Amino acid sequence: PQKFFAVKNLLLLPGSYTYEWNFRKDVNMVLQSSLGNDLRTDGATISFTSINLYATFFPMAHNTASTLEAMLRAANMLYPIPANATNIPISIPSRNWAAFRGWSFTRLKTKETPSLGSGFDPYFVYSGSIPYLDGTFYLNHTFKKVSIMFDSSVSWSPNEFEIKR
């Protein structure tokens, strides 16, 4: 299933559009392994033969479309953490203060998060569970204390929270 429009939920009126999408042949990101051993160098490969798209249109009167047309006239950030670090002072880039309806956070591993944002990451040498993509986070118990600076915040508004003493 197509996902981008599963969370955006787009609809198209006339226009004769073009729709092109790319797929992956990197074995690490497409497959999985119990051990997590680099499947790329082990000798695993993938190959496609034919991909076809299935779509479902629906009726809607041109009058309704004209009525509508005349009628209406989350950010992700990853921060480093050197080895054997204990403190981490971060600074959020200044964006629209509005829409700050709470934020989440968890700890991952550099060897597990892929450098999404290219065609192929040569440094991704692991094919196990990618918590950055399937939500299987497990390093949540390694947190001690998180402190916000003195700048005021709306409460559902303390500054420091103790995780474990």
Binding to other proteins in span 55-74, by CB under 8 A: 55-62, 64-65, 67-69, 71-72
Q: What are phi and psi of 5, to 5 degrees?
A: -80, -10
Number of residues that bind other proteins (CB under 8 A): 91
146 binds other proteins (CB under 8 A): no
In 3D space, the residue among 92, 91, 130 whose CA is nearest the CA of residue 110 turns out to be 130
Strand ranges in 119-162 using DSSP code E only, listed in sequence order: 145-147, 160-162
The mark string for 87-116 relative to other proteins (x by CB under 8 A, - otherwise) is: xxxxxxx----xx-x--------x--x-xx
According to CB under 8 A, which residues from 4 to 33 bind other proteins? 5-6, 8-27, 31, 33
- Contact map string, positions 34 to 53, toward other proteins, x by CB under 8 A: -x-x-x--xxxxxxxxxxxx
The minimum distance between CB 141 and other proteins, in angstroms, equals 22
To other proteins, the closest distance from the beta carbon of 163 in angstroms equals 14
Residues linked to residue 162 through DSSP beta bridges, in sequence order: 145
Burial 110-132 (b: 16+ CB within 10 A, else e): eebebeeeeeeeeebebbebbbb
